[PDB]
């Protein structure tokens, strides 16, 4: 049992609902929130943005260190960092942003780094602004991710469509 609530179950594992990932995460506080990151951990806008916001840009001086040092990820990578006032974790993830021109095929290797955590609260990866297909984003999540994912769609219109059309 966890603390999640009113989520549609579409999977064994997988579960949806129509919901703002920020107001999940404050009050679920889940072990892992899934950030829609770019390689640059540059929170500028969509969910990295929103997540960023309500870190109060904690989320973002942590980033910048990281990547002071690291360099930046690869599309389809990731990395671990605080979740701050929001999860324990953050997950991190590059999804292909169809927009700046990337490579859809990386978006099962994006999803690929959710199996390393057995719960996670996520967004629909490489929807919205990333470009993607969004039905595509919910076959390859549901098709990839062997371990819980609670995935928080913010846009309604959206989340009615993935669940009206979802095989
Ligand atoms: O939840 C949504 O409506 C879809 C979506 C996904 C991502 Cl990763 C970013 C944005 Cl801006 C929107």
Redesign the pocket.
Known sequence: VNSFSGYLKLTDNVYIKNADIVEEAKKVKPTVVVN?ANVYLKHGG??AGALNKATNNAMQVESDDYIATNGPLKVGGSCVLSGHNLAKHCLHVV?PNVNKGEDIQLLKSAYENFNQHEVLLA????????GAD?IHSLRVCVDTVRTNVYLA???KN?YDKLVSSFL
């Open positions: 829609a969509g969910v999804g967004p629909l990866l490489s929807a919205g602004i990333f969004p769609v913010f846009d959206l």
